[PDB]
Amino acid sequence: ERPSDLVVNRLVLFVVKGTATSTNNTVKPLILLEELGVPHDIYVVEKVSAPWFSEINPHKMVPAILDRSPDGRDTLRAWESTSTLMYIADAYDKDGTFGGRNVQERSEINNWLTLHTAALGPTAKYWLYFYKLHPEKLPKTIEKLRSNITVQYDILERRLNEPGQQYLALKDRPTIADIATLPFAMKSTAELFGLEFEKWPKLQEWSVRMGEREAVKRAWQRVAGFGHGEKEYGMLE
Amino acid sequence: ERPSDLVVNRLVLFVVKGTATSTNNTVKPLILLEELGVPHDIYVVEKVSAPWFSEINPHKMVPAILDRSPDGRDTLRAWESTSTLMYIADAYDKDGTFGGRNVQERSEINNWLTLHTAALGPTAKYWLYFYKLHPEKLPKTIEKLRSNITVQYDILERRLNEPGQQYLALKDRPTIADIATLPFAMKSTAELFGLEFEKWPKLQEWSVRMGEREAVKRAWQRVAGFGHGEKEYGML
The CATH number of whichever domain residue A186 belongs to comes to 1.20.1050.10
Residue A175, SS3 per DSSP: coil
- From chain A, pick out residues whose CB is under 8 angstroms from the CB of B122: 118-119, 122-123, 126
Contact A159 B58 (CB under 8 A): yes
Where b means 16+ CB within 10 Å and e means fewer, A47-80 reads: ebeeeebeebbbbbbbbbbbbeeeeeeeebbbbb
Residue B203, SS3 per DSSP: helix
> How far is the CA of B185 from the CAs of A111, B155, B178, B202, in angstroms?
24, 12, 10, 11
Residue A60 annotated as lining a ligand binding site: no
Contact B114 A82 (CB under 8 A): yes
Q: Which of B111, B132, B151, B154 to mutate to test the interface with A (most CBs of A within 10 A)?
A: B111
State how far the Cα of B85 lies from the Cα of B175, in Å rounded to an integer. Answer: 10
Contact B69 A121 (CB under 8 A): no
Structural domain that includes position B202: 103-215
Sheet order of strands, B11-15 included: B75-79, B64-68, B11-15, B40-44, B234-235
State how far the Cα of B216 lies from the Cα of B34, in Å rounded to an integer. Answer: 8
Contact A110 B91 (CB under 8 A): no
Of A61, A115, A101, A65, nearest to A85 (Cα)? A65
State how far the Cα of B64 lies from the Cα of B79, in Å rounded to an integer. Answer: 4
State how far the Cα of B56 lies from the Cα of A116, in Å rounded to an integer. Answer: 17
Contact B121 A126 (CB under 8 A): no
- From chain A, pick out residues whose CB is under 8 angstroms from the CB of B158: 58
Q: Find the closest chain A residue to B79 by CA distance.
A: A111
CB of A206 closer than 8 Å to CB of A160: yes
Residue A67, SS3 per DSSP: strand
Mark out the alpha helices in A58-200 (DSSP H runs). 81-92, 103-115, 121-128, 139-160, 176-181, 187-192
State how far the Cα of B105 lies from the Cα of B103, in Å rounded to an integer. Answer: 6
Residue B43, SS3 per DSSP: strand
State how far the Cα of A227 lies from the Cα of A235, in Å rounded to an integer. Answer: 10
> How far is the CA of A136 from the CAs of A130, A132, B141, B144, in angstroms?
8, 9, 10, 12
- Residue A15 CA, distance from chain mean position: 11
Residue B93, SS3 per DSSP: coil
Resolution (A): 2.5
Residue A62 annotated as lining a ligand binding site: yes
CA atoms within 13 A on the CB side of B115: 33
Residue A204, SS3 per DSSP: helix
State how far the Cα of B130 lies from the Cα of B116, in Å rounded to an integer. Answer: 19
> How far is the CA of A28 from the CAs of A34, A177, A235, B67, B154, in angstroms?
10, 10, 19, 31, 27
The residues near A230 (Cβ < 8 Å, ≥ 6 apart) are none
- Between CA B44 and CA B50, with CA B47 as vertex, the angle to 5 degrees is 115
CA atoms within 13 A on the CB side of B132: 8
Q: Alpha-carbon dihedral of residues B209, B212, B215, B220, nearest 10 degrees? A: 110
State how far the Cα of A147 lies from the Cα of A50, in Å rounded to an integer. Answer: 36
- From chain A, pick out residues whose CB is under 8 angstroms from the CB of B156: none
Which structural technique was applied? X-ray
Of A45, A77, A69, nearest to A236 (Cα)? A45
Beta bridge partners of residue A64, listed in sequence order: A14, A79
Residue B76, SS3 per DSSP: strand
Residue B77, SS3 per DSSP: strand
Question: From the CA of B58, how many Å to the nearest CA of chain A?
Answer: 6
